[PDB]
Design an enzyme around this catalytic site. Structure first.
Site, PDB file in Angstrom:
ATOM      1  N   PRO A   1       0.761  -1.264  -0.030  1.00 56.40           N
ATOM      2  CA  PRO A   1       0.022  -0.071  -0.022  1.00 56.40           C
ATOM      3  C   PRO A   1       0.825   1.262   0.147  1.00 56.40           C
ATOM      4  CG  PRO A   1      -0.191  -1.112   2.114  1.00 56.40           C
ATOM      5  CD  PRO A   1       0.358  -2.094   0.963  1.00 56.40           C
ATOM      6  N   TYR A   2       2.162   1.080   0.213  1.00 57.94           N
ATOM      7  CA  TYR A   2       2.999   2.276   0.138  1.00 57.94           C
ATOM      8  C   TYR A   2       4.366   2.438  -0.800  1.00 57.94           C
ATOM      9  CZ  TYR A   2      -0.074   2.918   4.247  1.00 57.94           C
ATOM     10  OH  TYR A   2      -1.073   2.995   5.045  1.00 57.94           O
TER      11      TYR A   2
ATOM     12  N   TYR B   1       5.691  14.985   5.523  1.00 56.62           N
ATOM     13  CA  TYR B   1       7.113  15.160   4.615  1.00 56.62           C
ATOM     14  C   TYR B   1       7.264  16.363   4.047  1.00 56.62           C
ATOM     15  CZ  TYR B   1       5.924  10.063   4.360  1.00 56.62           C
ATOM     16  OH  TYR B   1       5.476   8.669   4.469  1.00 56.62           O
TER      17      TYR B   1
ATOM     18  N   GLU C   1      10.393   1.516   5.982  1.00 49.89           N
ATOM     19  CA  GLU C   1      11.709   1.416   6.451  1.00 49.89           C
ATOM     20  C   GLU C   1      12.116   0.442   7.316  1.00 49.89           C
ATOM     21  OE1 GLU C   1       9.701   3.972   6.888  1.00 49.89           O
ATOM     22  OE2 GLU C   1       9.849   4.857   8.887  1.00 49.89           O
TER      23      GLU C   1
ATOM     24  N   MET D   1      -1.370   3.453  -2.367  1.00 55.95           N
ATOM     25  CA  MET D   1      -2.333   4.254  -2.147  1.00 55.95           C
ATOM     26  C   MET D   1      -1.857   5.738  -2.979  1.00 55.95           C
ATOM     27  SD  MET D   1      -4.130   3.509   1.040  1.00 55.95           S
ATOM     28  CE  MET D   1      -2.777   3.154   2.152  1.00 55.95           C
TER      29      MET D   1
ATOM     30  N   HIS E   1      15.172   7.650   0.413  1.00 53.61           N
ATOM     31  CA  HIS E   1      14.483   7.906   1.683  1.00 53.61           C
ATOM     32  C   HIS E   1      14.378   6.948   2.617  1.00 53.61           C
ATOM     33  CE1 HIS E   1      10.790   9.818   3.177  1.00 53.61           C
ATOM     34  NE2 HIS E   1      10.602   8.701   3.496  1.00 53.61           N
ATOM     35  N   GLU E   2      14.136   5.708   2.264  1.00 61.69           N
ATOM     36  CA  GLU E   2      14.287   4.501   3.283  1.00 61.69           C
ATOM     37  C   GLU E   2      15.523   3.991   3.939  1.00 61.69           C
ATOM     38  OE1 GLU E   2      11.531   3.889   3.735  1.00 61.69           O
ATOM     39  OE2 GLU E   2      10.370   4.571   1.929  1.00 61.69           O
TER      40      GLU E   2
ATOM     41  N   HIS F   1      15.817   6.817   6.822  1.00 58.70           N
ATOM     42  CA  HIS F   1      15.363   6.379   8.003  1.00 58.70           C
ATOM     43  C   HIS F   1      16.055   5.371   8.884  1.00 58.70           C
ATOM     44  CE1 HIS F   1      11.242   7.795   7.610  1.00 58.70           C
ATOM     45  NE2 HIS F   1      10.771   7.207   6.530  1.00 58.70           N
TER      46      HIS F   1
ATOM     47  N   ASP G   1      -4.278   6.321   9.643  1.00 59.59           N
ATOM     48  CA  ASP G   1      -4.745   6.185   8.425  1.00 59.59           C
ATOM     49  C   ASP G   1      -5.329   7.035   7.531  1.00 59.59           C
ATOM     50  OD1 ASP G   1      -2.987   3.740   8.459  1.00 59.59           O
ATOM     51  OD2 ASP G   1      -4.375   2.358   8.681  1.00 59.59           O
TER      52      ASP G   1
ATOM     53  N   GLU H   1       9.514  12.230   9.289  1.00 56.67           N
ATOM     54  CA  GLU H   1       9.408  12.460   7.660  1.00 56.67           C
ATOM     55  C   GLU H   1      10.153  13.605   7.251  1.00 56.67           C
ATOM     56  OE1 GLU H   1       8.890  10.039   6.077  1.00 56.67           O
ATOM     57  OE2 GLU H   1       8.106   8.915   7.635  1.00 56.67           O
TER      58      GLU H   1
HETATM   59  C1  LIG Z   1       3.977   5.519   5.518  1.00 51.25           C
HETATM   60  N1  LIG Z   1       4.118   4.331   6.137  1.00 51.25           N
HETATM   61  C2  LIG Z   1       4.949   3.193   5.400  1.00 51.25           C
HETATM   62  C3  LIG Z   1       2.675   3.747   6.170  1.00 51.25           C
HETATM   63  C4  LIG Z   1       1.669   4.884   6.753  1.00 51.25           C
HETATM   64  O1  LIG Z   1       2.583   5.032   8.232  1.00 51.25           O
HETATM   65  C5  LIG Z   1       1.848   6.124   8.910  1.00 51.25           C
HETATM   66  C6  LIG Z   1       2.445   6.923   9.587  1.00 51.25           C
HETATM   67  C7  LIG Z   1       1.942   7.854  10.352  1.00 51.25           C
HETATM   68  C8  LIG Z   1       0.636   7.893  10.427  1.00 51.25           C
HETATM   69  O2  LIG Z   1       0.080   8.974  11.452  1.00 51.25           O
HETATM   70  C9  LIG Z   1       0.144  10.181  10.908  1.00 51.25           C
HETATM   71  C10 LIG Z   1      -0.441  10.924   9.759  1.00 51.25           C
HETATM   72  C11 LIG Z   1      -0.257  11.960   9.436  1.00 51.25           C
HETATM   73  C12 LIG Z   1       0.239  12.886  10.424  1.00 51.25           C
HETATM   74  C13 LIG Z   1       0.614  12.407  11.653  1.00 51.25           C
HETATM   75  C14 LIG Z   1       0.644  11.106  12.024  1.00 51.25           C
HETATM   76  C15 LIG Z   1      -0.146   7.016   9.694  1.00 51.25           C
HETATM   77  C16 LIG Z   1       0.514   6.113   8.927  1.00 51.25           C
HETATM   78 ZN   LIG Z   2       9.280   8.151   5.354  1.00 53.80          ZN
END
Ligand SMILES: CN(C)CCOc1ccc(Oc2ccccc2)cc1
Ligand SMILES: [Zn+2]
Ligand SMILES: [Yb+3]
Ligand SMILES: [Yb+3]
Ligand SMILES: [Yb+3]
Ligand SMILES: [Yb+3]
Length: 608
Positions: free
Chosen positions: A264-265, A381, A269, A562, A293-294, A297, A373, A316
């Site tokens: 999904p991404y 980021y 990392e 996604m 990027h990874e 991390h 999510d 991020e």
């Molecule tokens: C990217 N990863 C590989 C998959 C998704 O991981 C997430 C990381 C942080 C997260 O929570 C948030 C979302 C927005 C602002 C702050 C915090 C929600 C999902």
């Molecule tokens: Zn990242």
């Protein structure tokens, strides 16, 4: 400070120091079954109970000191899961450690996991499982304090059908036949560096490996190994740059796993084993910033960790900052500026799409009663990056700001921190420049929605040709379309092509005749580069070209990243000619999708 995404006892109450996971993967039942042994250290006097996060777990028993103990599951609290209270048999003093062994089984509907049938894989013969725990899905695999404020080492033994291979976010520590079941193998893993639990990862499938550097194997199904080894060949050179910028790489191995298309991404990392989407496989290494990027991390995120998800931007922004420095080292400072400016463009897009007052356009957010999510976007980021780039320029340039970066990583390694910890350290490091820092609009940067109060300075050198071509198309009338020709692109890199398309997409719709001519002269339908094709297909759909409908539906469903899948489905739903097709296609694919992606696209489409 409180982690509003976790129901477990906080780090002030107790801290998990270690997990020993022994489990078995059952593809027939789509369950992981086994024991999670948590070595827990009390942070309180007279500690007599504690609470763990869980989600859709079946608990069989909890053992301490060789005997079952009392526990209870509370009512489920939506996306947070169900809190699990455990009665300790003997009160613990401060700093005392005990081992709690929980026998559990996951649900098929685990939001952490996707179970693929053979048909959904490249090989067609074997099934495949992968996990994705970030942010708060580890609790849907095993009971834990599911909060990044707590760091633990882990060891694991995983039993799988012998025809398959298990990998985890850890150093591989041998395989043997399963002494209890000759049709199975046991794979062993050790993670000796303490990690937040969101970094726990597991894949099980028909995996093969190829060495591509002295500390890097790429893993995938056989069908993708050859392409992946080429695509990511610059990994070691990126690791060496990253070490120069961040200090020692402490994790030993840096392997890559190229997942099936429904990952999904873009990347995750996971330590010792970065997971990436196969949509990186452009055939020319052009999407390698995701690897940068990874890699980054391994310092910003996995060594220095956000204490709660409200402070996700720390993970991020700093990682994107390091990422663009790696790219800048490899391809020049002008290229770093090109990508920085492109990132600003993505932040503009996000702010426009969310709205300039939307709470998740803030840098530091409040996830109280919000599913992480649902909140996730590129804001932390790019707004995080913009803040750091702004500070770099304010404080004397990249060489100076990189000195801060390395010091920050050293200072907070193996710890979990908040935005105030970061800003306190920034002020200490740059104490001779407080007068300058004190004029920063901190409250706006950190807590106001919308675009940031100041835009950084960007070199325009590699961007100019992208804007110029985009502007030619935007300002063209019908009687100008004849002048466009494939020669227009002859000196554009794939990166510049992508930026031309991003610039043009920001002004969409264009007239239908313009988009038809674009295909006629440039043959964009033939490009396999996923970032280019994504923007091209959005441009076609938003400009109401019916011919693009099947192409967009196909990209939206044949992969599941996604970043691409969600906006394609949304564009298709917004276009009257494709709306009903978009909904039906989703409904037909829903049961076979990643659980998180299925939930989000379903909300996006208002299907229920
Ligand atoms: C990217 N990863 C590989 C998959 C998704 O991981 C997430 C990381 C942080 C997260 O929570 C948030 C979302 C927005 C602002 C702050 C915090 C929600 C999902
Ligand atoms: Zn990242
Ligand atoms: Yb006591
Ligand atoms: Yb089928
Ligand atoms: Yb402070
Ligand atoms: Yb004209």
């Amino acid at each position: 400070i409180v982690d509003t995404c976790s129901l477990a006892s906080p780090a002030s109450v107790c801290r998990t120091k270690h997990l020993h996971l022994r489990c078995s993967v059952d593809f027939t039942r789509r369950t992981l079954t086994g024991t999670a042994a948590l070595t827990v250290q009390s942070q309180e006097d007279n500690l007599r109970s504690l609470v763990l996060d869980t989600k859709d777990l079946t608990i069989e028993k909890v053992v301490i000191n060789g005997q079952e103990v009392k526990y209870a599951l509370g009512e489920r609290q939506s996306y947070k899961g169900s809190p699990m209270e455990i009665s300790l048999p003997i009160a613990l003093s401060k700093n005392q450690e005990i081992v709690i062994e929980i026998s559990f089984e996951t649900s098929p509907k685990s939001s952490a996991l996707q179970w693929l049938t053979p048909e959904q894989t490249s090989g067609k013969e074997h099934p495949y499982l992968f996990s994705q725990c970030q942010a708060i899905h580890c609790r849907a695999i095993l009971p834990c304090q599911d909060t990044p404020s707590v760091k633990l080492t882990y060891t694991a033994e995983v039993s799988v059908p012998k025809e398959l291979v298990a990998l985890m976010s850890a150093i591989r520590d041998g395989e043997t036949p399963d002494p209890e079941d000759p049709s199975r193998k046991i794979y062993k893993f050790i993670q000796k560096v303490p990690i937040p639990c969101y970094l726990i990862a597991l894949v099980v499938g028909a995996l093969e490996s190829r060495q591509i550097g002295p500390r890097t194997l790429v893993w995938s199904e056989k069908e993708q190994v050859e392409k992946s080894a080429y695509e990511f060949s610059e990994t070691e050179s990126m690791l060496k740059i990253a070490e120069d910028l961040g200090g020692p790489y402490v994790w030993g191995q840096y392997d890559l796993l190229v997942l099936p298309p429904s990952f999904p991404y873009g990347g995750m990392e996971n330590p010792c084993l970065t997971f990436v989407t196969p949509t990186l496989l452009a055939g020319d290494k052009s999407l390698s910033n995701v690897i940068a990027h990874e890699i980054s991390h391994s310092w910003t995120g996995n060594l220095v960790t956000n204490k709660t998800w409200d402070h996700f931007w720390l993970n991020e922004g700093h990682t994107v900052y390091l990422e663009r420095h790696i790219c800048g080292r490899l391809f020049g400072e002008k290229f770093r500026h090109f990508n920085a400016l492109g990132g600003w463009g993505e932040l503009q897009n996000s702010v426009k799409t969310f709205g300039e007052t939307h709470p998740f356009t803030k840098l530091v957010v409040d996830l109280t009663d919000i599913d992480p999510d649902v909140a996730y976007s590129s804001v932390p980021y790019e707004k995080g990056f913009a803040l750091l780039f702004y500070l770099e320029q304010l404080l004397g340039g990249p060489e100076i700001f990189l000195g801060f970066l390395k010091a920050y990583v050293e200072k907070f390694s193996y710890k979990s921190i908040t935005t105030d910890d970061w800003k306190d350290f920034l002020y200490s490091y740059f104490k001779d420049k407080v007068d300058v820092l004190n004029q920063v609009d901190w409250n706006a940067w950190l807590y106001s929605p919308g675009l940031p109060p100041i835009k950084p300075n960007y070199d325009m050198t590699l961007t100019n040709a992208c804007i110029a071509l985009s502007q030619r198309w935007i300002t063209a009338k019908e009687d100008d379309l004849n002048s466009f020709n494939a020669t227009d692109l002859k000196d554009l890199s794939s990166h510049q092509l992508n930026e031309f398309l991003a610039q043009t997409l920001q002004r969409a719709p264009l007239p239908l005749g313009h988009i038809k001519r674009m295909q006629e002269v440039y043959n964009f339908n033939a490009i396999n580069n996923s970032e280019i094709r994504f923007r091209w297909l959005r441009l076609c759909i938003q400009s109401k070209w019916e011919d693009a409908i099947p192409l967009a539906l196909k990209m939206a469903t044949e992969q599941g990243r996604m970043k691409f899948t969600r906006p394609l489905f949304k564009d298709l739903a917004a276009f009257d000619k494709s709306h009903d097709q978009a909904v039906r296609t989703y409904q037909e694919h829903k049961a076979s999708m990643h659980p998180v992606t299925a939930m989000l696209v379903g909300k996006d489409l208002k299907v229920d």
